[model samples]
Every structure is written in C-alpha cells, then in structure tokens.
Target: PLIVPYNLPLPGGVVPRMLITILGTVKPNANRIALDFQRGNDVAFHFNPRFNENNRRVIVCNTKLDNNWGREERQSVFPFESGKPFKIQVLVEPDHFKVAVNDAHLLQYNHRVKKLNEISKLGISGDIDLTSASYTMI
Candidate 1:
C-alpha cells in the first residue's frame, strides 16, 4: 500500500527536457492513482488513472487552482492492469508534458501553469504500491 501521499521535492524544479519517472504496482482492487505536479498549493498537473470509477476505464488529466478542478481531459486507453507492476514517465517539453506508461506513449498534457520553474514538488497518492520515483534533467 502507498503511504497516503508521497511527497518528493524537486530540488531544481522541472524544466524542458526533463523526465519524471515513477515505478509502482497497482493494487488488485485499485480505484485510482494520482500523480500531481505541485507549486505550493497549486496543482499544475494532475495525472489520474481511474480503474473502476463509474464502471469506466480512463485516465483523467486536469489541474487544480485553489480548490476547484479544471476541465478534465479523459483518454479511453487504459494502459494498466490490477496487481501489476508498471512504469510511468513524464517528459517535459517547452509547451506540453508527454506521458508514457510502460515505455509506450500515452498522452500529452499542455502547460497550464506556464511557469515550469514553480513546479517544485511531486505529490503522488491513491490505491497502489509505490516502489520508486525519480527525476532527471536532460
């Protein structure tokens, strides 16, 4: 089980050509997994994979300002399985964030906050076993 929310600090913030990687396993009865890029209390990127929500399979990507959630970008391609280990990678680009699951391209989320330097933390949560998370600026 994951430790509620795993808070990983981004020492130099996220810039273009950076890669954010997360390794973990989805619980058998997993409901969701959320990876959030945070700037203080503002959520710039919210990458959420919902397994059984509304009996639907999808990935809901959005952002949070204050306490309100922005419009969600839902993708029907669910690239995860219950009780299976997987890798998630987020590559930072000048205008968007490209995400890949298990090394396959999943989706791209455009910059909502604009200031990449302010995205100084990574917050992960939900029903999964987190093994490791790391970042590299290339």
Candidate 2:
C-alpha cells in the first residue's frame, strides 16, 4: 500500500495548462480522502471526497488563505465507490482547475489562490491507497 499522507514535490511547481493524474482505490470502509496543492503554508487547492460526513455524499473543494478556509464548493454527484479503483485528473487552466473522475468531468474550481507557480508541493491523505500519480506540464 502506498504511504498515507503522501507528499510529492512538483518540479518547477505547477503552471497554467498542467495536468495531474492520480490513480487510487478507496478503502471498503472509508470516511474521506483529500488532495492539496501547497506552497509554503498555503493550500492553493483542497480537494476532498467525503463518504460519510454527516451521512452525506459530496466532494468539497476549497482553498486556504492565511490559515483560513474559504467557502467550500460542494458537488452532489458521488462518482467514487468503496473498494473500487478510481482515476482522478486535474487540468490547471488559466483561470480554473478542471477535475475529472474516472474520465468523466467532475467539477471546475476557479483560481482562488491565483499564483499557480507558487504551488510547490502535492499532498494526499485519508482512507485510500494510491497506485500511481503523475504530473505533466502541458
């Protein structure tokens, strides 16, 4: 199993028109899994899949600034299933992050923390195991 709270440094950091791909499987009894793009102490994007938060099924997207979380963008479609492998892709556009799950469009998050190049690190956590991950500058 891949290490929990996995951390990877982005080569030259993320730039506009970059694509990030993550392959993983959720545990049979999972609560959540989260991915973050970080620079120093700031999180440019916080992507979270909550399986049993208040008995709700949703994906929460947000950003952190000055140690505070911004308003969350929650989606109703739960594309993830327990014990099943999933492919997640994120395309960094000039103004937003376009995310896809299992090759289907999931959601779009506008640039909250605008300095894309400032995002130097990637973090992954929660009840899941990652098989592979890649970042490509496009």
Candidate 3:
C-alpha cells in the first residue's frame, strides 16, 4: 500500500526547463489529491484536484508562504478519474508551471514563489496510488 502523503528530496533542486512527471492511479473512492513543490517549509506550488467539494470536481491551485496559503485558482477539465491510470507533466518554466494531463495541455500557474532553485522537495498526498515521481533534464 502506498503512503497517503509522500515526500521526496530533489537533490540539486529544480531548474527551468526541467520536466517533472507524476504517474498515479486514483483510489476507488478518491475524494481528493494534492501535489506540491516546496522550498524548505514554504509550498511553492500546490496543485489540488478535488473529486468532491460541494459536489464539484475541480482542480484548485495555490501557493503557501510561511505556512499561509494564497488565494486559490480553480480550473476544470476533469482529466483525472478513479480506478484508472493517469499521467501528469509539470514543465518548470521561468514564470509558471506548464501543466499537461494525459497528453493534453491543462493550465499554467504564474509564479508566487520564484526561487525555483531552492525547491528541494516534491510533496504528494491524498487517496491515490503513486507509481513514481521523476524528472527529466533539458
């Protein structure tokens, strides 16, 4: 069984043009899941997909500084599903994380925390099966 919240240190941190890939399958009764990139204790980016929030399925994006969360940004394409496999790509860019789900472009979240080089941890949590989180250099 996979851990609910899994964190891995990313040695040398991340840089622009590096592509981070996450492969996973949602739980049979998944209600929510979140992906995060962090610099120390601050969350540089928080990508959350909720299966039910007021009975709404949406992807909510935000950032946290000093443990305080920023305003949320929401999007809907419903790329994820329960009990099936999925692939997500986060292209690290200068200004935003260019995200793609499956094989289609999803969304871009502008920088709220700009120190990408200090981002040393990848944080994942929720009701899901994490296959692997890997990165490719450009």
Candidate 4:
C-alpha cells in the first residue's frame, strides 16, 4: 500500500492505512480487484498515511471477514496487468470499518471485537514504488 497526501479521503485525527498485498486481480477490471480479507492470519491488511501540505491522513477501522477459515485455497483471477495503479482508502468509525478506493466505491467490514481499541498497529508493504507510510493518533 502507498500513501500520498493528495489521495487521503479522511481529515485530520482519523487513523488510516494503505493495504499493500500481493492479492491477484482481473484484467481491465477495477471491479474484480475488490477484496474481502478473510483468513486465519495470512491475510494481513496494513497501511499508513502519506500526509502532505494539506495534512490529510487515513485510519483503519476494521478488517474483512470473507476468509477461508484457515484453509489455504489458491484463488485465481483473470490476471490484470500491473501498471494499473489502485488507491485504497480505509476509514474506521465508532461501529464499523469503512473502506473505499478512488473516492467512490466502498466496503464495510464489521469489527470482530466491536471496539476501536483493538486496532493498535498499521501494515504497509509492496513494490519499492511506495514513497512513505505514516500513522498518527488523536
């Protein structure tokens, strides 16, 4: 996941992360790249904000539940070519985790613990193209 100041969707004081994973995607279809992170521990979602002059940031609220229940299943996709950059936005409110991309589409992931206190860390990893990842608490 990459964080760019101009890409953040939330304002200050909100915690956010840019999930950077190797999950596959479909060719010519941004819709197919949408994901639900459900796995015992392999499916890790992590990110940090790329604050800029505007000082925009991100906060992670919750994670996905579409998991294999500890099963190692190899899911296949149409193999969308790289170079198609995707901007993921994650927002955590009081009751649910709201995730979106490109400032339009969004997904809701319920909190397994039902409390924001459970979120303590952010994850971010991918190609070296990632500039910087940052996190703050308010």
1-138 in candidate 3: lDDT tens per residue? 446588867788878899988888998989988998999889988999999989889999998999899899999877999888888999988888899999899999998887778889999898789898888987
TM-score of 4: 0.40
Is 1 or 4 the stronger prediction by lDDT?
A: 1
TM-score of 2: 0.95
What tens digits encode model 4's per-residue C-alpha lDDT throughout 26-117?
12422222223322332333322222213322222234444433322221212223345444545554554555555543455544533233
How well is each residue in 27-133 modelled by candidate 2, as lDDT tens digits?
89888989999977989999999998888889999998899999999998989998999999999988898999999999999988877788988899888888877
Q: What is the lDDT for 37 in model 4?
A: 30
Report the Cα lDDT for candidate 3.
0.88
The better candidate by TM-score, 2 or 4, is 2
User: Candidate 1, residues 1-138: lDDT per residue as tens digits?
Assistant: 346579888876789999999999988988899999998899999999999878998999999999889999999999999999999999999999999999999999999998889999999998888988889877
Error of 4 at 36 (Å): 12
Worst 10 residues of 2 by lDDT: 1-10
TM-score, every prediction: 0.95, 0.95, 0.94, 0.40
Give candidate 1 misplaced runs (Cα > 4 Å): 1-4
Q: Residue 87 in candidate 2 has what lDDT?
A: 92
Which of candidates 3 and 4 reaches a greater lDDT?
3
